[model samples]
Target: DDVTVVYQNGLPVISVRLPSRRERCQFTLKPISDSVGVFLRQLQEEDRGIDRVAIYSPDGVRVAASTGIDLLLLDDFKLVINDLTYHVRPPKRDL
Candidate 1:
């Protein structure tokens, strides 16, 4: 497995499953006050090639940009770029 939880607090850590270049895009986040758009912004900052992306629920529903990231505070979530879907693996955190 390529997934592992490095640390946590009250939210699940996140790792993006990229198509190429890099396999995983992991980072620390504060979902309680962070937004979906903010997450993508941070993601892009890490990898410029990973531009223009959106967050989506596992059910194929697009997440709201203004919505708090707490909505998808799971170990695994969804990501979309162009037309491809990716998964976000969260690191374990003790609440």
Candidate 2:
């Protein structure tokens, strides 16, 4: 799925093609989860980027992350579809 990321600060804030708004926060999470599922499904349907995701659970029992990382080897953090790393920022924001 083609995606667009709007960097509000330094965070990798993504916009979802499908949305799930939180209302008060003008900052949306729709395109985020939407795109995430899109990529995840792509991978799941054919094991696309199974080698590039960061999935985890508490208590350190279940964890799956790419990039030679070990959840047991780091702090609490995770989620994201495969192959959405690069960014192309535009000169202007849409109003």
Candidate 3:
């Protein structure tokens, strides 16, 4: 499954992929449950250096910030931040 959330100790570790930059990033969220808006806020809080963040569905429809994380696609989704776009996917677990 893409955009999967696995509990690490006590936090939700979410994996994200940057298609344009050809990179991947992951983080653990303090709040186990949150909306897209809250997720973006956290990303910004981590000094991600992104001004604005937008999530898109696999069909290319822009996802609302109020959308729940569980409602998102497991794969092939897009994350748009300012002028950058990235693809979100499941983590390649190795740890």
Best-matching candidate per lDDT? 1
Q: Candidate 1, after superposition: displacement of residue 42 in Å? A: 0.5
Task: Name the weakest run of 10 consecutive residues (lDDT summed) in model 1.
Answer: 1-10
lDDT agreement of model 2 with the native: 0.34
Candidate 3: which pairs clash? 2-74
| Residue 12 in model 2: lDDT | 38
**Candidate 3 lDDT over residue span 16-94, tens digit each:** 5533443556766544267777777766765555677788886889888776555553444687767777666633333
Ranking by TM-score: 1, 3, 2
Local distance difference test scores for all models: 0.64, 0.34, 0.62
Worst 10 residues of 2 by lDDT: 18-27
- In angstroms, what RMSD does candidate 1 have relative to the true structure? 3.8
Off by over 4 Å in 3: 1-12, 16-25, 29-32, 73-75, 91-95
lDDT (Cα, tens digit) per residue for candidate 2, span 1-95? 33344445633343332222222112222322334334344435444324554333433233432222211223332343353432223223322
RMSD of 3: 6.2
